[PDB]
Amino acid sequence: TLTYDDIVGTGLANKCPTLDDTARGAYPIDSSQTYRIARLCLQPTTFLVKEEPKNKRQEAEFVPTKLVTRETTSLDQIQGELKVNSDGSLTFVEEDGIDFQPVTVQMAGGERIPLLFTVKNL
Amino acid sequence: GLPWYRVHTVLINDPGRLIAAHLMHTALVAGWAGSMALYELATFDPSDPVLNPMWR
Ligand code: CLA
Ligand code: CLA
């Protein structure tokens, strides 16, 4: 088990926990029980921006960008209710957490695209 | 003395200073190439190769 001092400055704090390859199981849902997500974590690996179409009005594509705001991008410690619905579907209702990060990515040619990467009120 | 249009004839029997002058000329030309490339990069819009290419 790792401490703050093991992790601090390594970049691991911006990484979501992972599971090993053996974890291909199934988590039973009891429609009589109440559920919650205690921790939801989102770790972006790629930011794509839709190019502003020349004026040909064809399919404008999402193009790669370079992250310039460093390892400050992940959403974490997000919690919320996990409703079991009549039809057996599950609905996560986000209540709180670190559910946003400002992010600046840089386009080819230099254009910087700030965005509020978020799942607020998910 | 030398007329103005003959000032460089002093290099004719001076291979070392002729080499110096050629070096200076080459330096000027290469400096031109660099600065020209820089100005074009400072002005070129790469956003539309179809209807706004470099030759436009
Ligand atoms: C390739 C360029 C080049 C080279 C290698 C030389 C080399 C030589 N010239 Mg020069 N010369 C040049 C161009 C060049 N000349 C030009 C264009 C002129 C007309 C102005 C002259 C006029 C000239 C004279 C009258 C004489 C020489 C002489 C000589 C020799 C001694 C150096 C000297 O006195 O400089 C003098 C030359 C200069 C200082 C060049 C003028 C600088 C101009 C204005 C550009 C400066 C760049 C500037 C920072 C950019 C401005 C940007 C603008 C948009 C505001 C030497 C062998 C002498 C010589 O030995 O004669 C016996 C001599 O008496 N040259
Ligand atoms: C490789 C190219 C080259 C070279 C090395 C020379 C070398 C020489 N020529 Mg020139 N010459 C050339 C091409 C060349 N010539 C061409 C193409 C022409 C026809 C236009 C001439 C016509 C010519 C004449 C009529 C004469 C020479 C003479 C001279 C000598 C003295 C130059 C001098 O002192 O000027 C000093 C020059 C200045 C102080 C200022 C000149 C300013 C010019 C006119 C305007 C600005 C030019 C700009 C800076 C250059 C931009 C670069 C360009 C390529 C785009 C010298 C040995 C003279 C000679 O033999 O002496 C006995 C002479 O009488 N040449």
Ligand code: CLA
């Ligand atoms: C070893 C054989 C040799 C070689 C390889 C060269 C090579 C060349 N000669 Mg040179 N030359 C030689 C023998 C040689 N020469 C001899 C025996 C004579 C009679 C004395 C001359 C007289 C001569 C004259 C009069 C002139 C040349 C010029 C040139 C150059 C024109 C191309 C240029 O400038 O590109 C652009 C340059 C580069 C892309 C950079 C090249 C990197 C250099 C070679 C490294 C410099 C460090 C090196 C240890 C010191 C100089 C090496 C020297 C042997 C050239 C070029 C470097 C002309 C010149 O020098 O123009 C400026 C010129 O005017 N040569």
Ligand code: CLA
């Ligand atoms: C292979 C291509 C080439 C060639 C053959 C030359 C040849 C030469 N260059 Mg040039 N040069 C070149 C490419 C070339 N250059 C490039 C790509 C650049 C970067 C822009 C330069 C920049 C350059 C500079 C900055 C200078 C030269 C000069 C010279 C001359 C030095 C020898 C001399 O004493 O002439 C004596 C001069 C002449 C024989 C007159 C040449 C007249 C030209 C061909 C046309 C002039 C146009 C017009 C009358 C004036 C310009 C318009 C004005 C509004 C600016 C010579 C004619 C030097 C020189 O001219 O010093 C006096 C000089 O100062 N060159």
Ligand SMILES: CCCCCCCCCCCCCCCC(=O)OC[C@H](CO[C@@H]1O[C@H](CS(=O)(=O)O)[C@@H](O)[C@H](O)[C@H]1O)OC(=O)CCCCCCCCCCCCCCC
């Ligand atoms: C709008 C304007 C603003 C621009 C200003 C920027 C430059 C300012 C400097 C100009 C003043 C020059 C003073 C002269 C010095 C001198 O002593 O001359 C004599 C010197 C040798 O020293 C000398 O040599 C002499 C004999 S001899 O020449 O060696 O034969 C001897 O008299 C003496 O003892 C000895 O010291 O040799 C020369 O003849 C060179 C003089 C020519 C200098 C002008 C060229 C400027 C353009 C350069 C641009 C570079 C382009 C980029 C490419 C890489």
Ligand SMILES: CCCCCCCCCCCCCCCC(=O)OC[C@H](COP(=O)(O)OC[C@@H](O)CO)OC(=O)CCCCCCCCCCCCCCC
């Ligand atoms: C990009 C960087 C650029 C910097 C370079 C700077 C450019 C410098 C240009 C120098 C050119 C100066 C001209 C020399 C002018 C000058 O000195 O001429 C007089 C000169 C006489 O020279 P001599 O052999 O007699 O020797 C006397 C010495 O003192 C000269 O150095 O003859 C020549 O130079 C030949 C060219 C004749 C030019 C005659 C044209 C004038 C007639 C009138 C035309 C206009 C009216 C027409 C009406 C229709």
Ligand SMILES: CC1=C(/C=C/C(C)=C/C=C/C(C)=C/C=C/C=C(C)/C=C/C=C(C)/C=C/C2=C(C)CCCC2(C)C)C(C)(C)CCC1
């Ligand atoms: C030294 C030092 C340094 C730096 C250098 C530099 C800073 C650079 C440069 C270069 C440059 C930045 C300069 C230049 C070039 C320019 C020129 C040379 C041009 C010319 C012009 C012409 C010639 C034109 C004429 C005419 C007119 C003007 C218009 C119309 C017509 C015509 C075109 C004819 C380094 C770090 C490297 C290191 C080593 C040492």
Ligand SMILES: CC1=C(/C=C/C(C)=C/C=C/C(C)=C/C=C\C=C(C)\C=C\C=C(C)\C=C\C2=C(C)CCCC2(C)C)C(C)(C)CCC1
């Ligand atoms: C050894 C060392 C050093 C030396 C220095 C050096 C070596 C520098 C050189 C100087 C020089 C060598 C200068 C350069 C340059 C340039 C000029 C000053 C001119 C120009 C340009 C222009 C004016 C622009 C124009 C352009 C064109 C050409 C094209 C495009 C457009 C444009 C307009 C951009 C010292 C002393 C510090 C001290 C210590 C030791």
